[PDB]
Amino acid sequence: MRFFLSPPHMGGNELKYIEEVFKSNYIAPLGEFVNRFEQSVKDYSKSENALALNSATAALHLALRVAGVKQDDIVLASSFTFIASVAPICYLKAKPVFIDCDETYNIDVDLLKLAIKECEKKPKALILTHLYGNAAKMDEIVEICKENDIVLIEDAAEALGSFYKNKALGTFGEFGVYSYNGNAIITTSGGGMLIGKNKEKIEKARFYSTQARENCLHYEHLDYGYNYRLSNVLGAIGVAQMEVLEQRVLKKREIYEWYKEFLGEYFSFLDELENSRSNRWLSTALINFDKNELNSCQKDINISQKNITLHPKISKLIEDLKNKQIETRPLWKTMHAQEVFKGAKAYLNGNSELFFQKGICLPSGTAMSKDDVYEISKLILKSIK
Amino acid sequence: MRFFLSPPHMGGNELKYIEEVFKSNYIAPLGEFVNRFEQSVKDYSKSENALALNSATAALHLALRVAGVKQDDIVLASSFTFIASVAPICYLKAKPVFIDCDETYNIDVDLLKLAIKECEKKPKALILTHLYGNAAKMDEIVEICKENDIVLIEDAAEALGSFYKNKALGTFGEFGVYSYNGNAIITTSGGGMLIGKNKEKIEKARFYSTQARENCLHYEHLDYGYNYRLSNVLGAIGVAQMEVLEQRVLKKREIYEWYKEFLGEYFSFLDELENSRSNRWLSTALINFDKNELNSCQKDINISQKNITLHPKISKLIEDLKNKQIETRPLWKTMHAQEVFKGAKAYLNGNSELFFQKGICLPSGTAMSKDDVYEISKLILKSIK
Ligand SMILES: CC(=O)N[C@H]1[C@@H](OP(=O)(O)OP(=O)(O)OC[C@H]2O[C@@H](n3ccc(=O)[nH]c3=O)[C@H](O)[C@@H]2O)O[C@H](C)[C@@H](/N=C/c2c(COP(=O)(O)O)cnc(C)c2O)[C@@H]1O
Ligand SMILES: CC(=O)N[C@H]1[C@@H](OP(=O)(O)OP(=O)(O)OC[C@H]2O[C@@H](n3ccc(=O)[nH]c3=O)[C@H](O)[C@@H]2O)O[C@H](C)[C@@H](/N=C/c2c(COP(=O)(O)O)cnc(C)c2O)[C@@H]1O
């Protein structure tokens, strides 16, 4: 393939810091660059607490554990998301209630109110995805969660570098998670950060992350925990990648603006919320789309596996570009159509399914030039007419 | 500290292979060195299947999941072990039944038979620790598990490089796990390998390891999974470390033989099983110990948190050596005395608690010379008389 969605983009101080790790001989999930990695996420996000982990999935698992979610507790979540977001609900055997999205790709604010209202019992938490870097309607969701005493866990796994009203996505919730998996805006080759408001709670996540050891020489355990802690070698990568995070954000936004410029007449590019700044982690576009097709229903279902057919120009577009060795992908297939979540409760308004029909993820690698985006865009244009 | 239990010992091709990873641009939990890492574990262990993961804890979690352990299923396990071994029982909300150890530090064979006999229902699996690299009585345990249709999962997390009757520890069970955490005989700075007999099953673990995706472009999920997959950068480390594994094994055994030579008159060093080869991951020694103190009881309890006092010469020995900047540690404090496992069923014969009293983990780093071991040993001798 010539172009991937969002491959690694390295070329900083990664090797240099890794060599410092080798010199230290802390070849372990702890050490100076774990610490520095967490410092850098605090410096950037302005969250006061950060815990370097091996994945954002782990971060969410810990956020939920530390929030006191138990078996059969209700956890609200975004339907329009990647399964990692909600897999931890399954780990804790909590009961997921999935909620459709709005014009930002994120949980719809009125559906949220509906879903909470109709829970058979007070929901304990909400995992809010910020899909593709886009901010959800935070003042509203935050307030709703405050009003209902719902722990907000922002899943900003795709949204490191996104902002709403000058605040880092991740810093509104009690908890925030960022991914540094291989295709994230920056990477540790696999990694994550759990940030949060409560220093005790984060430090409790920290305790869980290293097998729930009491502070003593022998092994003493009042609870059970995990091995979730991030490798210091990978922490080094994290540090060097954090050095270019903002540069990456700035570039992903340029690439999106380019796509808009080359494809604007023929695709719909939904706007980020005024008073936000999406990291545009992937540039996405909707074909044959009118915003007034949104909210074509308001219902709750028990989920069944559902086959959703791509708009024909999307499936052709994917195939055409694949033949020219350009990776594109459908938008995330809603959890409300997934077999894994058979039986679980979901609120629909039609939107996530409609986005899956008409949407596409475009190559958004920050190593691409304008000319790259240009040649990709004209193959996209060739394909559709 | 001048000497740690088992720090990283690098100095091979680690940086070289990491640089190859950077050149590849697979800065992700997949790629060539993940693959090569798994190949090397197959070449060495002779297991036909290997799955590179971020920890041995993950490996065990997957071994249990894939074995079909469900909530409230009984899982037998070693008491004398590190909590990571049994934490996955907790993840699946299975019911642990812990079993005391014999003169090898591993599950006693008769107690095992007892515990199985008295289970309120057929136990689904057994997680057998091979403590400190030492082989448990495999022909017996294997047979017992076969007879009772118990899935044997060897926890060889500490025993990479150990053998029983010419077979790699890890390759007797349906599943085997190895750790490459920061203090293991070799390291990836955090990592593990799930090996096993059944290629389907291992590949099923593989599927779970990357979020349980159906093989298609869009995201389609019939089940939920994890993010457990190992980083390719760390895989590179694994490959280069696997190149010295046997050398390390050979060295750990030398160091043990040295400790025996310098401390033999004053400590008891229990022998590995004839027709085995322990990796001697840590050199361990028992003070004021007679083998006939073993099996001083045969009872089942419901666990309560129990304070076990070190033999005074052990606690003094630890303090004395700590003051000379040498790390020593007690032996692993049995799960049958841990608060976390309050209420759970445990079979005792006295042995694990007696080993905790009189035992010590000695510095066993493979970078140590004979002179190092010598100077450590005479400080040990100074301390005890
Ligand atoms: C391995 C990887 O990159 N995983 C991310 C990805 O999953 P998936 O689509 O299954 O992965 P693939 O694209 O098949 O993986 C191929 C890898 O090869 C790499 N690559 C390819 C070519 C090359 O030359 N070099 C290279 O390295 C790619 O950049 C990529 O990382 O796509 C998802 C959208 C991401 N989402 C994670 C997520 C979580 C959980 O984060 P966690 O992954 O646990 O940190 C929580 N919530 C939400 C809303 C999330 O979205 C995953 O982190
Ligand atoms: C981080 C680490 O090394 N963890 C291993 C260790 O846990 P713990 O005692 O809490 O760790 P500490 O010694 O406090 O960690 C300090 C780290 O700093 C490193 N270090 C220190 C000085 C230096 O200069 N450089 C340096 O890097 C050390 O080598 C060490 O790795 O000691 C346990 C005995 C190991 N056991 C794991 C296990 C599992 C699960 O394996 P997993 O860890 O999930 O791969 C399943 N079953 C069984 C029977 C197991 O035993 C853990 O893998």
From TrEMBL, chains A, B:
Identification of the protein by name: Aminotransferase homolog
InterPro entries according to UniProt: DegT/StrS_aminotransferase (IPR000653), PyrdxlP-dep_Trfase (IPR015424), PyrdxlP-dep_Trfase_major (IPR015421), PyrdxlP-dep_Trfase_small (IPR015422)
Family membership noted in the UniProt record: Belongs to the DegT/DnrJ/EryC1 family.
Transmembrane segments: none
PANTHER family linked to this entry: DTDP-4-AMINO-4,6-DIDEOXYGALACTOSE TRANSAMINASE, TRANSAMINASE
Matching Pfam families: DegT_DnrJ_EryC1
UniProt EC number: 2.6.1.34
Active site: residue positions: 184 (proton acceptor)
Annotated positions of the N6-(pyridoxal phosphate)lysine modification: 184
Species of the source: Campylobacter jejuni
Enzyme class, broadest EC rank: transferase
GO molecular function terms noted in the UniProt entry: pyridoxal phosphate binding; UDP-2-acetamido-4-amino-2,4,6-trideoxyglucose transaminase activity
Keywords noted in UniProt: Aminotransferase, Pyridoxal phosphate, Transferase
Gene3D superfamilies: Aspartate Aminotransferase, domain 1 (3.90.1150.10), Type I PLP-dependent aspartate aminotransferase-like (Major domain) (3.40.640.10)
GO BP terms, alphabetized: polysaccharide biosynthetic process
Superkingdom of origin organism: Bacteria
Binding sites annotated in the UniProt record for pyridoxal 5'-phosphate: 56-57, 85, 179, 183, 227
